[PDB]
Design an enzyme around this catalytic site. Structure first.
Site, mmCIF file in Angstrom:
data_model
loop_
_atom_site.group_PDB
_atom_site.id
_atom_site.type_symbol
_atom_site.label_atom_id
_atom_site.label_comp_id
_atom_site.label_asym_id
_atom_site.label_seq_id
_atom_site.Cartn_x
_atom_site.Cartn_y
_atom_site.Cartn_z
ATOM 1 C CB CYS B 106 46.300 39.239 31.085
ATOM 2 S SG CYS B 106 44.900 40.467 31.232
ATOM 3 N NE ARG B 109 47.337 38.609 27.135
ATOM 4 C CZ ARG B 109 48.148 37.664 26.656
ATOM 5 N NH1 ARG B 109 49.285 38.012 26.071
ATOM 6 N NH2 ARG B 109 47.831 36.378 26.781
ATOM 7 C CD1 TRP B 278 36.067 44.135 33.440
ATOM 8 C CD2 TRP B 278 36.855 46.183 32.963
ATOM 9 N NE1 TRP B 278 36.136 44.252 32.072
ATOM 10 C CE2 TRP B 278 36.615 45.499 31.754
ATOM 11 C CE3 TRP B 278 37.343 47.499 32.913
ATOM 12 C CZ2 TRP B 278 36.859 46.075 30.508
ATOM 13 C CZ3 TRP B 278 37.579 48.075 31.672
ATOM 14 C CH2 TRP B 278 37.338 47.361 30.485
ATOM 15 C CD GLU B 283 39.719 37.701 37.781
ATOM 16 O OE1 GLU B 283 40.818 37.937 38.329
ATOM 17 O OE2 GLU B 283 39.140 38.529 37.036
#
Ligand code: HEM
Ligand code: HEM
Ligand SMILES: Cc1cc(N)nc2cc(-c3ccc(CN)cc3O)c(F)cc12
Ligand SMILES: Cc1cc(N)nc2cc(-c3ccc(CN)cc3O)c(F)cc12
Ligand SMILES: C[C@H](O)[C@H](O)[C@H]1CNc2nc(N)[nH]c(=O)c2N1
Ligand SMILES: C[C@H](O)[C@H](O)[C@H]1CNc2nc(N)[nH]c(=O)c2N1
Ligand SMILES: [Ca+2]
Ligand SMILES: [Ca+2]
Ligand SMILES: [Cl-]
Ligand SMILES: [Cl-]
Ligand SMILES: [Gd]
Ligand SMILES: [Gd]
Ligand SMILES: [Zn+2]
Lengths: 403, 402
Positions: B106, B109, B278, B283
Site C-alpha cells: 500500500c 499508508r 480513494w 490504478e
C-alpha cells in the site's frame, strides 16, 4: 518443489527448476526480502567450480560423458593439483563469457547472448598493450554505428602478481566537474573518476560532454592515462523530430555502452578486467541518464520549454516531458544510423528469451525490478511476468573500486 | 543482521530494525528471491492473541499495568471456555489500523491513522450484511469527498461457517464473454459476472454494467443484492483538450472498496471486512484501462490521437497512456471526487517511510508494488531501497468461497 511462476497477462504458468542449482547465496531470507537492494553483497572449492564449469561446456556441445569430457576433467584436476590454478581452453573462454551474459539477472538484452564476439587478451603484458586491445574492441563494437556485442578478456587473477584493472566504470564516460557550490558541470555519476583522472595528469575541460581518458592498470603498477582518439568515440547529437528548439539544448550521448569495472568469473577463475559492450536501450539515456535528478536532470527545463504547467503534479508534466526526451533519443540515434532499441521492443525480445530459456534450461534468473523499464512499466509485457532471481556461474560480478 | 537500506537519490542510509519482528515467513530464500510473485490449536491462538494484546498496550504507553494483566487473563479464560475470544472495540480499531499500516503493497499508508471502523460483528443474515455495506459505501463516498473506512463482519469460529463477500470489490463492472470469444466489459470479472447470472441477476449488455453483490451468511447459500444506483458514484471520463475522448464512453467508479481479503488480528480471522480508501490515478488510467487483460484501450486511444502505431519507437503506447491518465485526473477533479496522482502519492509515501523510521524503526514495503506502473523512475520511491516482511495484524489473501 520448484517455484511456480506465472504470467498474468496471458495466464501461463511455468516452474523454474534451474533455480535449484543456484550455487552462491543472495540476500533474501524467509523473514525478509531484500530484492530491491542495489548491491546485495582452496584447491577444493576451485575444483568443484572448475568441474561444474567443464560439465556445462561439454553439455553445450552435446558431448557430455565423452572421452574428451573425462580427459579435460582429468587435465584440469592435475593442473590444479600441480599449480593451484588452471588455464581455460580458448573455446571454454568463449563459452564462459557467453554464459556469464546469459546468467546476468539484470540484463534485458539477453536474447542476443549467443552473438558475442570474444577477444582473447590473456597474453596482454602492459598498460600500453591494454590500450591497444581496448581500441580494437571499440572499433569492432562500434562498426560505424552498426553496433556489435563484444567482450575483451585480459589475463586472469593469479597469486603473486597484481590484477589488470580498468579504473573507469565504462569505456566512454562524460566528465563531471565539481563546481564549488556542490553542483556539477557534466555527468555527476563521474565526479570521482574525473578527479582521479585529473589527479593523474589529465588536463580537464569545462564542457558538459567531455569524454574522459582511460585510466589503465597493469599488474603491480599505478594506473596510466590514455586518451581515446576522438574518431573512435562515436557520439549522437540529440534533436527532436518535431520540437526544433530541442536541438538547441546541445545534448549528446555516446553510441557505445561498454562497462569496464565488473569482474568476470568462469569455473572459479576470476578476470578482474574484461570490458563488455552491447547497444543502448533508449530509456537508459532518455529516462535515467538525462532525467534522473542526480544525473543531467533536464526534465524541468524541457517541460518548461514545452510550455507545460510545472506548478502542479497533476498535469503530468513530468511524464510528458520524459516521453518526449525518450522520443528525441530514439529519433536522434535512428537519424545518425546508430543502433538503438526502445523499451517496448527490448522487453518483447526478453519475453522470447524467457520462453527459449525455459525450454533450454528449465528457467532463467531475472531481477524483475531491473528488467521492467523505468517508464511505462506496465505497458511492457515483462511487468506482468513473475520472475525468479538467483545467482548462476559463470557470472559478471561487482568488485571493489581499485583505489 | 539489521538490513542497511539506502536512498540512491539523496545518498541517505537507514537500518530496518523492525524486520526482526517479522512474525511470518515469506517466499524468499538465500538461494532464490521470489519477491515478484503476486501470491507468495488453542495454544497457537493464545500466543498470537497475547502478542497482539502486548502490542496494543505498549502502543498506548500503559503496558505492564493492571489493565494489561487484566486483559491477558480475560482472553485466556475466554478461549478456555469457548475456544476463541472477543476483541474490545478499541482493540478492533487499533488492529484494523495496524493491518493497514503493516500492508507492504500500500502506497497510501501516510493516511493509516485516519480510518473509520464500522463494527458489524453483531451482524446476522445477508440482508443485514447488505445494510452494513450500503452504510459503508454511503459514508465512504461522502458525495465525492472520500473517507477511508472499514466494516468488520463476524469472525470465523469453530464448527460454524463464515461471512463472505463473493465480489472482489463492492463496485465491479460486468464481464460478458462473447461469441467472438472476446469479453465485453471487464475481463477481470468474467467469473463473478457468471456467478451473479447463475444466482438470479439478469445481465446487461454494456461495457460498464455495475455488478450486483453476492453476500453469504454462514452456511446459507449466497444471496443476490442490487446496489441503489444513487449509492454508486461514477465519473464519466473526458479529456481537457482532446474533445473526442468523451465520446469513447469511458467511465470508472469513485470508491475503491476491496471485499475479498481476510483481516487477521490477534489470531482472530475476519473473512469479511471490506475496506476502502480513494484511488491513485494510475490504478484506473494505466492498470484498469490499459492492461492487455483488462479494458485494453491503449491502441484505441492512440488511433484517435492519430499516432503512428505500426512502430514501437514512436512511443505511441507511452503517449496514449499519459493522456489516458490526464483524462482520469481531470475527470475526477472536475467531478469533485477525491483522487491522487502517482507523483503526489509517492512523495507522501516517502514521508511515511521517514515517519515510520522514527515511529518504530522501519516499514515493510514491496518495491514492485510501491513504484507506480508508469514513470517509475520519475518518482522518489524508485530510488529508495526497501525491505519486505510480514507483520501482524495484517490483511491477507484467501481462497475463493466457491
Ligand atoms: C546487445 C544489447 C544489450 C542490451 C540492449 C542490454 C541491455 C541492458 C540494460 C537496459 C541493462 C540495465 C542497465 C541499467 O539499468 O543501468 C543491462 C544490464 C546488464 N547487461 Fe545488458 N545489454 C546488452 C548487451 C549486453 C552484453 C553484450 C553483456 C555482456 C556480455 C551484457 C551484460 C549485462 C550485465 C551483466 C548487466 C547487469 C550488470 C549489473 O549487475 O549492474 N549486456 N543490460
Ligand atoms: C486513502 C487512500 C489510499 C490510497 C491512495 C491507496 C493506494 C493503494 C495502491 C495504489 C495500492 C496498490 C493496489 C493495486 O495495485 O491494485 C494499494 C494496496 C493496498 N492497500 Fe491501500 N490505498 C489507500 C487506502 C487504504 C486503506 C484505507 C486500506 C485498509 C484499511 C488499505 C490497504 C491496502 C492493502 C492491504 C493493499 C494491498 C492488498 C494486496 O496485498 O494486494 N489502503 N493501496
Ligand atoms: C552491456 C550493457 C548494455 C546496455 N545497453 N546497458 C548496460 C548497462 C549497464 C549498467 C551500467 C551502469 C550501472 C550502474 N547503475 C549498472 C548497469 O547494469 C551494464 F553493466 C551493461 C550494459
Ligand atoms: C484500499 C485500496 C485503495 C486503493 N486506492 N487501491 C486499492 C487496490 C487494491 C487491490 C485491488 C486489486 C488487486 C488485485 N490485482 C490488488 C490490490 O491490492 C486493494 F486491495 C485495496 C486498495
Ligand atoms: C532502489 C532500486 O532497486 C534501484 O534504484 C534500481 C531499481 N531498478 C533498476 N532497474 C534498472 N534497469 N536499472 C537501475 O539502475 C535500477 N535501479
Ligand atoms: C508479477 C508482478 O509482481 C505483478 O505484475 C505486479 C507488479 N507490481 C504491481 N504493482 C501494483 N501496484 N499492482 C500490481 O498489480 C502489480 N503487479
Ligand atoms: Ca597449459
Ligand atoms: Ca462460433
Ligand atoms: Cl549508461
Ligand atoms: Cl481497482
Ligand atoms: Gd515544431
Ligand atoms: Gd480525425
Ligand atoms: Zn526476495
Amino acid at each position: 518443489k520448484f517455484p511456480r511462476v506465472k504470467n498474468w497477462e496471458v495466464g501461463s504458468i511455468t516452474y523454474d527448476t534451474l533455480s535449484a542449482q543456484a550455487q552462491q547465496d543472495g540476500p533474501c531470507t524467509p523473514r525478509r526480502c531484500l530484492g530491491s537492494l542495489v548491491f546485495p553483497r582452496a584447491p577444493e572449492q576451485l575444483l568443484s567450480q572448475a568441474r561444474d564449469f567443464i560439465n556445462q561446456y561439454y553439455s553445450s556441445i552435446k558431448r557430455s560423458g565423452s572421452q574428451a569430457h573425462e580427459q579435460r576433467l582429468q587435465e584440469v584436476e592435475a593442473e590444479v593439483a600441480a599449480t593451484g590454478t588452471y588455464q581455460l581452453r580458448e573455446s571454454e573462454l568463449v563459452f564462459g563469457a557467453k554464459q556469464a551474459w546469459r546468467n546476468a539477472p539484470r540484463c534485458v538484452g539477453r536474447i542476443q547472448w549467443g552473438k558475442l564476439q570474444v577477444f582473447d587478451a590473456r597474453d596482454c603484458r602492459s598498460a600500453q598493450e591494454m590500450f591497444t586491445y581496448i581500441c580494437n574492441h571499440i572499433k569492432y563494437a562500434t562498426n560505424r554505428g552498426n553496433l556489435r556485442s563484444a567482450i575483451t578478456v585480459f589475463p586472469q587473477r593469479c597469486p603473486g602478481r597484481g590484477d589488470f584493472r580498468i579504473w573507469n566504470s565504462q569505456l566512454v564516460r562524460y566528465a563531471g566537474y565539481r563546481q564549488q557550490d556542490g553542483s556539477v558541470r557534466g555527468d555527476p555519476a563521474n565526479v570521482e573518476i574525473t578527479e582521479l583522472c585529473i589527479q593523474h595528469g589529465w588536463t580537464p575541460g569545462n564542457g558538459r560532454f567531455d569524454v574522459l581518458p582511460l585510466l589503465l592498470q597493469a599488474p603491480d603498477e599505478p594506473p596510466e592515462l590514455f586518451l581515446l582518439p576522438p574518431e573512435l568515440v562515436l557520439e549522437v547529437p540529440l534533436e527532436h523530430p518535431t520540437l526544433e528548439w530541442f536541438a538547441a539544448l546541445g545534448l549528446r550521448w555516446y553510441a557505445l555502452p561498454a562497462v569496464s569495472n565488473m569482474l568476470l568469473e568462469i569455473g572459479g577463475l576470476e578476470f578482474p578486467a574484461a570490458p563488455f559492450s552491447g547497444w543502448y536501450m533508449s530509456t537508459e539515456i532518455g529516462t535515467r541518464n538525462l532525467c534522473d535528478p542526480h544525473r543531467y536532470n533536464i526534465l524541468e527545463d524541457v517541460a518548461v520549454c514545452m510550455d507545460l504547467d510545472t506548478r502542479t503534479t497533476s498535469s503530468l508534466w513530468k511524464d510528458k516531458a520524459a516521453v518526449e526526451i525518450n522520443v528525441a533519443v530514439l529519433h536522434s540515434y535512428q537519424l545518425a544510423k546508430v543502433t538503438i532499441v526502445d523499451h517496448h521492443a527490448a522487453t518483447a525480445s526478453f519475453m522470447k528469451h524467457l520462453e527459449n530459456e525455459q525450454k533450454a534450461r528449465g528457467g532463467c534468473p531475472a531481477d524483475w525490478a531491473w528488467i521492467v523499464p523505468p517508464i511505462s512499466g506496465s505497458l511492457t509485457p515483462v511487468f506482468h511476468q513473475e520472475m525468479v532471481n538467483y545467482f548462476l556461474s559463470p557470472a559478471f560480478r561487482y568488485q571493489p573500486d581499485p583505489w
